[PDB]
Every structure is written in structure tokens, then in C-alpha cells.
Design a protein around this ligand. Structure first.
Ligand code: 13U
Ligand code: CA
Length: 223
């Protein structure tokens, strides 16, 4: 997260870290056994870390649970990042508490101008790299369809939206991938892609979760 703020320990209790001997992506807890992340985060050997604040120190409240299933959308395209969504099943159910909590799926899509919360342990620099120990947060609005497509002509599908700030300085970034964009208590986006981080005229691009609610439900019920 570039230009954000320290969230505060466990203030984003649905935020998970995906770990393979290091943090490599975020995710969102949607029930005690399932996490939503990005398809481009797929790999073997995923450990889900719930209840985290400082990802480099055991502080208490962590739960570490291996992934037992990682389900990339069948129509994911790694070149266009269309359908950039993955479901992870946990080997055992998480224990839900004030610090480890699910986020609701949308019942309808969000509109332009809606303010959302974006969070993660990704890079905090727009030039160069710096990775934080504790979770970072950013408030950011959804942009209009016309401004999104203006920004990235011929690259925005109906399964994407743009959010953030065209003036530069405030964005998600590498390592935030797969993490949440939450609007009015609903998981509306997944951190997916962008041109650089926090660059002028190049906002963040997010997977449009409302288009996937039926697929998510249908996939969880059959697995
Ligand atoms: N909000 C941001 N600025 C931002 C940018 C990047 C990321 C992490 N995502 C990435 O690095 C992803 C993974 C594979 C290549 N990615 C890219 O972001 C690479 N760039 C292209 C841009 C235009 C073509 C359409 C399809 C997307 C890729 C996360 C957030
Ligand atoms: Ca920790």
C-alpha cells in the first residue's frame, strides 16, 4: 500500500496473508473454511495466516492453516488478468473471533464514487521497494467506467474496475495482490493489477467480485 496508514492491529479481521516461507499475497476470509484471493497468486505450498498484524513477529491471535484446495477460476487468463480470482479452502476451519472474522460478499455491484478500504502488506513505495511489518490501509474511491477505460484503453473487461487516485501517491502495489477492497461492509474487489504503483493517471485495477458471487457459492457448495 503506497500513501496509506497503519491500520491498527486486527482492525481488518478478514485480511489474511498467504505465506510460502514469506508473505507473497493477501486474501479475504469469507467463511470459516474459505478465502478469496487472486488467481495470479496461485502456487503450491500455501499457508494461510489469519489474525495477523506484524507478519514477522508472533504476537498472539495468529492462526496458521494450510491450504487444502486452491481453485483458480477456469476462465482465468494470465495475459489479460480477466477473471483474476481464486478460492482457497483451509485444511481445518478457522476459529472465528473479534480478530478473525469473515467479510460479506456483495448483493449488488458498487457504483462510481463509493469509498472503499484497501489493505495489505505490499510495497509502500512508488519508486523502489519497502515492505512493512504491520498491515497498511488506504481509503479509495471507485472510479467511473469512462475514467477507468481512459486510463487503460482496451484492457478493462466487465470483470474489472478501477479505484484510487489519478493525482498519484495513493495506491495498492506488489504484495497487496489478492487482498480486499471492501465497500460498505461488502467485499467488492480483489487487488489485481496496475501500471506501476501510485503513478499519475494509472489507478489500481481490481477484480469485480459482484460478478462472481454465484460462482463462489456454487464452487464452495460442491467442494
Ligand atoms: N494497484 C496497483 N498499482 C497494483 C499493480 C500491480 C499489482 C500486482 N499485480 C501485478 O503485478 C500483475 C500480475 C501479473 C502482471 N501484473 C501487472 O500488474 C502487469 N501489468 C499488466 C498491465 C496491462 C495489461 C492487462 C493485464 C495486466 C498486467 C498490484 C497492484
Ligand atoms: Ca504476527
Amino acid at each position: 500500500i503506497v500513501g496509506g496508514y497503519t491500520c491498527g492491529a486486527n482492525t481488518v479481521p478478514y485480511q489474511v496473508s498467504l505465506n510460502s516461507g514469506y508473505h507473497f499475497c493477501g486474501g479475504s476470509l469469507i467463511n470459516s473454511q474459505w478465502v478469496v484471493s487472486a488467481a495470479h497468486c496461485y502456487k503450491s505450498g500455501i499457508q494461510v495466516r489469519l489474525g495477523e498484524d506484524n507478519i514477522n513477529v508472533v504476537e498472539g491471535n495468529e492462526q496458521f492453516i494450510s491450504a487444502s484446495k486452491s481453485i483458480v477460476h477456469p476462465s482465468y487468463n494470465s495475459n489479460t488478468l480477466n477473471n483474476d480470482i481464486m478460492l482457497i479452502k483451509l485444511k481445518s476451519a478457522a476459529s472465528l473471533n473479534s480478530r478473525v472474522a469473515s467479510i460479506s460478499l456483495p448483493t449488488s455491484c458498487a457504483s462510481a464514487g463509493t469509498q472503499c478500504l484497501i489493505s495489505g502488506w505490499g510495497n509502500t513505495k512508488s519508486s523502489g521497494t519497502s515492505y512493512p511489518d504491520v498491515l497498511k490501509c488506504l481509503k479509495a474511491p471507485i472510479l467511473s467506467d469512462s475514467s477507468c477505460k481512459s486510463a487503460y484503453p482496451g484492457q478493462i473487461t466487465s470483470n474489472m474496475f478501477c479505484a484510487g487516485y489519478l493525482e498519484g501517491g495513493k495506491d495498492s502495489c506488489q504484495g497487496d495482490s489478492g487482498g480486499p477492497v471492501v465497500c460498505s461492509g461488502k467485499l467488492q474487489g480483489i487487488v489485481s493489477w496496475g501500471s506501476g504503483c501510485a503513478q499519475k493517471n494509472k489507478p489500481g485495477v481490481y477484480t469485480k467480485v459482484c460478478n462472481y458471487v454465484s460462482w463462489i457459492k456454487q464452487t464452495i457448495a460442491s467442494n
